Design a protein around this ligand. Structure first.
Ligand SMILES: Nc1nc2c(ncn2[C@H]2C[C@H](O)[C@@H](COP(=O)(O)OP(=O)(O)OP(=O)(O)O)O2)c(=O)[nH]1
Ligand SMILES: Nc1nc2c(ncn2[C@H]2C[C@H](O)[C@@H](COP(=O)(O)OP(=O)(O)OP(=O)(O)O)O2)c(=O)[nH]1
Ligand SMILES: Nc1nc2c(ncn2[C@H]2C[C@H](O)[C@@H](COP(=O)(O)OP(=O)(O)OP(=O)(O)O)O2)c(=O)[nH]1
Ligand SMILES: Nc1nc2c(ncn2[C@H]2C[C@H](O)[C@@H](COP(=O)(O)OP(=O)(O)OP(=O)(O)O)O2)c(=O)[nH]1
Ligand SMILES: Nc1ncnc2c1ncn2[C@H]1C[C@H](O)[C@@H](COP(=O)(O)OP(=O)(O)OP(=O)(O)O)O1
Ligand SMILES: Nc1ncnc2c1ncn2[C@H]1C[C@H](O)[C@@H](COP(=O)(O)OP(=O)(O)OP(=O)(O)O)O1
Ligand SMILES: [Ca+2]
Ligand SMILES: [Ca+2]
Ligand SMILES: [Ca+2]
Ligand SMILES: [Ca+2]
Lengths: 434, 454, 445, 450
């Protein structure tokens, strides 16, 4: 009988994918991991969080992204084996013994992600990378059981790829670097579902120039323009999708909503059942992995639905605004120190109209290795050396610095206040005055 | 002075990026307000295709984006109709653009009464999404009603009447509900786009080129016949390759029995354990308001299932597990229920013999039970037909002039499946007369079909 | 150490960008050499669809790209066959991957014997592209043969025997030529993409997931039967909407009559004027070599037609003009030839009466061709069912021949419209037109 | 009786187009122009010439491109009349009396193109723009006959649009600007037929924001990103398709094949007949319009087949290389001045091995090609893509877009030296020379040894 390490499905298994057409699975191990409890739960977590409030097609899950990353990784490995094996190139070639570990790492790279990560980790101080390593290395998970079946040291080896400690730079960089399968998948996938496919670079063009070398992953010099296209697409996706103000307006609401809920919990004079059982360990700031694994997007929205009926005015309102899509509006400003006086003033105005500025205002800027080209020579050149102005795009700030406030403040008995407030806003830009 | 709400328009066009239609365009203030209402926003949290995502993992699109999609096709039809086929030039065969807003509201609101996994939900809880859509449109408690009523007191009732097909204008009615309406057209294109399948093989533009109004509703110029043919082909292929997929239905049967078991537990006066499913209580009790209904979505169900995995009922706990961990029931086809009856009874006996309660671990269903109707025209029934208009203005129905459409309508079929646990099909060192049962069971499955006990 | 030609792998996979398949992938030195060969490169200068481009102006794709496409589909099949259905796993019902190079060569070379405007050319000149394909593969004068002979001395004949369907492996024969083969799958996909008539797009990847070898040839998994239906449906839409188009056929008739007129002029000792058509001379005479035939492509003919516009024969000059300027004969539908015969004979008199020679300005035409289902579906147990047994009405559709009987005649016959005065000559046009109602012959005496 | 100007078809005619789905024709003038001998002639002329040797799908004709330019133009005119008429906007609006002239000019812009026109203009000193103006304004032409029926001055009016002298900038910039229907169709059409994803931007998004104003055509600010992506596609098609060294290797052969033929014809000492009668007026330098109108791609290849057996080793060999696809290889260098002696020496070695350097080598720039980079000049209105803000003011694209400024920033040409593949290799006595030659070729570039 065959070692588990080597168990090849007699018939290749395909999964239909809108982005890649088909995900192809050859190994029993990979199939088992796809079917595991903690990978399956990623079906219930949105890849893009609050972006579906701006781009309504952005309803894709982390599960389909994980499969897509594995699929791109697989395609890289095939090409490396066909064209750049150690057999042909030696030390600069690819060793296909590394395939299985590389594919598991690729598939499992995001397993530690929970619902609305950025916001959740801000409020509950979780870390999805450490939880990923915990999922891979803990005997309680189905993932660990599957990995342990490969060999005793295999769960830790797979974790070491994710932590970038694995001693093979080709494997580490396939999983994690500037142009990796992770990034290429979500650029393509986020573009496909949002409909903002300015993030169409051509994936096959990149797959034809990617190669291994003794120091990691490089790109043939003849495909420099393919690399440029990727840099450009990534730029376009950050600018048009990830940095979108309306998405972040919804994200600010969510952030304040979870925070208000936690404050209500922690406080002992608040004698009311939040009915938020699964969130309790996170309100207390003391949770297990099992408890973390029970959370998904629907858990949050169920709880928020219950909260619209809560005796707290702020919680009830913030829950409502999240579910009914009522984002905070924002104005742009470029200097935090110089805008401090103006922002404080306006915050007094917002308060005078009866919004508590702590939960109805925010200051926000986001939702928050080289690229080696290889000459026929064998020698390396960094992209910026051949293409500096495009390299400049990748390194830019793109900091979209903003002040958030209720739409109500714009155009009861304080109408003169709303006209006073809106006087400090011209074309979505904060005007600095007394 | 102030413009009537009915006539009010946005200062500039509002555009919603849509992966299927590129853009959704909004110009009327009424339409914007309706998109923003609580009852419509709710549809973001309900999946268009329910359990299909377990087979086609891209299929995570919502009812909200499908509703905007239908509104958008409708908008596109009205525009073509007004520019090319108005009453200003055709009279009783033309399109009166007074009807635009009512048609647009109806299109946007057509699926507003859908809940989570509505087909299953309606089977277990006896709800009716058509009744509830009309209830949402016509009840003062809802934001939809407040908006519609603000257009005119009689407007809610009129919008509702379009959806019940009682509205007196056949062009308006058929645009929203016929054999080739904005609704079917969107979900075929969009379901194909997200599943990643080709099967929405049809060109909306080649159909929007030939669509026209007439006295009795909506028709298609004869020179566009082949474009209508492709619509039918897409329809058929989406049905037989996606909507009717045995693995998706395997997951739907788990769901159905999961909710049925919860209901049976709650209403059994001697089961005492807290199901912690407060929002489902009104539905277990079979006594619910509109408000209680509007609080339901896919994530409410999913959250309750997570809790139920730990509930001390063995069946409930297990079925919650199977749904969340993706453990579909397997199935085999049969033909005649009456001929298959003794075989099915015997197989249920072997299933029970290994610890599975066959009431919850087996099922029988047909593709015909699903809300997907094949095109079958009837000379006596006008709303069953797709009409083509010859260049002389004469109408002929599609199948009579298309051998291909006649051939697909002719091979319209519902299958019949028997569901059972996969564990019934499985090398062990010793064979207990209990391990014998699985081996016995397998000899009844051949080429995916039951072998009759004969 | 030294590697046999048959085994010579490219160290790096060569890819050719293709709008239909995205990429054409080449592993073998033999395949690359065949692609670069003179007689395959010559297919760049032969339109896949001939006169269809007069109706669908995007249909300018060459036979070259179709050949690479058939080759690419075939190797995708071979890869799936090796991965999933090898002899190693399934024995007698499996794929032997030693058959790959020959299957690949046959796929690439299947259409090499096609010349310009194939249907018309073969009607007038009596050439046979299948026999010429076999000639090209097995004649030492071609670069194709020189290449295959290097694989092994018996290799050219083996490759030819695949095309002639005499090769003893049915899986190989049917991959190349049967009802659902790489050949048909490519041209339906390619012709859809270039015409923009994308009704004839079934899903290739779905078919590739159900296709399967067995001892007796090629079959399709039972759970994939709806994918087979899709292909049947696409092929039907393409035949009805593109291949049988009345207007492309209109141009085809002109071309047929133009070539026939030229041949006749050359044949006639009375006509002493030089046609300037040196590459057609062996074909006027009915006595040609392979070498002479390989010089022919679409450009050769259009160049000659340009010259012929100035030749002192008014039928040749005018027909050449009609072909280059796009002046197709118009047509009317009729049903059975026997009831319509007397009316058609009368209309040819009227046509002759106004100055058009009906031998050249009329035709009876019912296809692009100038004057039953066999698909096995496999059950899980390995038994076979023919497609018509599980899907009869879709099967009927495939076996149905779209008989579109038409009578072609000059547009001028109904071109007239409204005249200020009619004379007993303008009377002929008006009398002619009364026999045509909404694109159909009216059967009067 | 309807004036010809206004004659509509009883029923709109549609032309299936794989790029735009449908080409729509409503005016009788336009249909008549489509059917004219001079437009039908574009069916037999390839849009991309030698690119098909690299991207074998690129077999599309100039005729299909011209219909596409017409269809985009039509879409813009519809949008302008519907949303931005003079009736509502005044001097910043569109006058729909200009529709017919705009449509005729869009359809006719490329009518003067002959086969492989860049190479042909180099060898025979043709000018396709002058010939376009000649076809439009010469009575012997069907095009002219059709236009002359419209109104008295209409032919010369139409030609004046093409030469950009027409006094309506909205009309001129729709046909010819940095973002005209012409560029938009060929980027889309070329990407579609080559099978490259790069030149696919969203036409629909651009048409949503396109706008007339007093000084021509502008694009609403809220649509900047769609304009950005047009530039991205444009850049991507230049560097990856139009500037491809393998297609260019084939162009160099073609250039030299025609050159050798002209040379053979001029020389009275060369007896043999090239039997290429339609090229004779061009060989001699003296040709008429009708003679030009007879030429197409098929004519050239027909002659090359004949030339394969003409008793001139160079001409026969080069005809063979073109017909059989034997492109020259190439290497980059920086500037002609610094690289001068290396080229001289390489030519010596190429000669030593028995290739006449004059016909088997060549120097080439991508700049010499009919593809201009976006290079906006603040003084030169023409060079600019304008974006309209809410207040009505204009701002040039590169000004508001770092992405566009980045691409315009590294919008550089190249330099290549061509040579036979034979110079880079089992039994040769010239093996010493091949070895030396390729020592000057490192990383696909000329090594300045000498
Ligand atoms: N209003 C609204 N926009 C949506 C929805 N789903 C997606 N979107 C898209 C379309 C909008 O252009 C974009 C921004 O959303 P909003 O309309 O809330 O932001 P905006 O700053 O445009 O507010 P405004 O109404 O213009 O004051 O998000 C929805 O449910 N409602
Ligand atoms: N196994 C599995 N299949 C998935 C998943 N998501 C989508 N699919 C698709 C891929 C296949 O087209 C289809 C197969 O479903 P299953 O593997 O559960 O059933 P199948 O009968 O193919 O395998 P079985 O014989 O039950 O082991 O569902 C997933 O998470 N796991
Ligand atoms: N007229 C014309 N049609 C073309 C051309 N290229 C493609 N087509 C397409 C569009 C037409 O609808 C289709 C049929 O061509 P025709 O206009 O020659 O024939 P049809 O019988 O439709 O029109 P007719 O009754 O002769 O005015 O061919 C072209 O260069 N000229
Ligand atoms: N060899 C060849 N390539 C073609 C053909 N049609 C398109 N191509 C494409 C495929 C390649 O991506 C590209 C380059 O072809 P070549 O083989 O002439 O240049 P390459 O750089 O591979 O040089 P080499 O193979 O070393 O002579 O042209 C063809 O008929 N033959
Ligand atoms: N909620 C969101 N809103 C907008 N953009 C998002 C959101 N979530 C993710 N993205 C974008 C930005 C991320 O770079 C990318 C997904 O990467 P992810 O698996 O979340 O790792 P990450 O949170 O560490 O990214 P980053 O380091 O850029 O903050 O998609
Ligand atoms: N000139 C044409 N006009 C219309 N249709 C064509 C033309 N040429 C080919 N086709 C259609 C008919 C064929 O079924 C298909 C391609 O097959 P192909 O081998 O290139 O031609 P063919 O001469 O073998 O015709 P057939 O496949 O019917 O025997 O496309
Ligand atoms: Ca990731
Ligand atoms: Ca619907
Ligand atoms: Ca073929
Ligand atoms: Ca042009």
């Amino acid at each position: 009988t065959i070692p588990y390490k080597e168990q090849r499905l007699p018939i290749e298994k395909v999964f239909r994918d809108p982005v890649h057409n088909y995900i192809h699975v050859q190994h029993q191990v990979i199939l088992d991991l796809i079917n595991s409890a903690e990978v399956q739960r990623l079906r219930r977590i949105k890849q893009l969080g609050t972006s579906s409030f701006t781009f309504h097609g952005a309803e894709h899950s982390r599960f389909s992204h994980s499969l897509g990353v594995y699929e791109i990784t697989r395609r890289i490995c095939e090409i490396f084996q066909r064209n750049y094996s150690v057999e042909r190139l030696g030390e600069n070639g690819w060793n296909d013994d590394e395939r299985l570990i590389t594919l598991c790492a690729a598939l499992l790279h995001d397993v530690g992600h929970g619902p609305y990560s950025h916001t959740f980790e801000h409020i509950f101080d979780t870390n999805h990378e450490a939880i990923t390593v915990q999922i891979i290395t803990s005997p309680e998970t189905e993932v660990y059981q599957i990995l342990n079946r490969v060999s005793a040291d295999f769960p830790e080896k797979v974790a070491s790829v994710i932590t970038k400690q694995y001693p093979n730079p080709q494997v580490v960089q396939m999983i994690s670097s500037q142009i990796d399968a992770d990034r290429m998948d979500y650029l393509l996938r986020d573009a496909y579902f949002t409909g903002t496919e300015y993030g169409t670079f051509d994936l096959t063009r990149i797959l034809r120039v990617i190669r291994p070398y003794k120091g990691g992953i490089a790109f043939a010099m003849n495909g420099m323009h393919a690399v440029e296209d990727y840099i450009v697409s990534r730029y376009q996706m950050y600018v048009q999708v990830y940095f979108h103000p309306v998405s972040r307006g919804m994200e600010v609401i969510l952030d304040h909503l979870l925070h208000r809920a936690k404050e209500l919990f922690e406080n002992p004079e608040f004698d009311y059942d939040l009915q938020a059982s699964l969130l309790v360990p996170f309100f207390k700031g003391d949770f297990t992995l099992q408890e973390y694994l029970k959370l998904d997007d629907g858990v949050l929205s169920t709880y928020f639905t219950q909260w619209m009926d809560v005796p707290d005015s702020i919680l009830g309102d913030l829950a409502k605004r999240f579910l009914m899509r009522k984002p905070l509006k924002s104005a742009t400003f470029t200097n935090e120190k110089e805008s401090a006086a103006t922002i404080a003033y306006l915050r007094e105005l917002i308060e005078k109209v009866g919004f508590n500025p702590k939960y109805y205002t925010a200051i926000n800027s986001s939702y928050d290795t080289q690229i080696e080209l290889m000459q026929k020579d064998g020698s390396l050149v960094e992209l910026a050396t051949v293409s500096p102005l495009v390299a400049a795009l990748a390194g830019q700030s793109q900091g979209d610095e903003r002040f958030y406030f209720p739409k109500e403040m714009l155009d009861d008995l304080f109408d003169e206040t709303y006209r006073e407030f809106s006087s400090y806003i011209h074309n979505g830009a904060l005007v600095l005055k007394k």
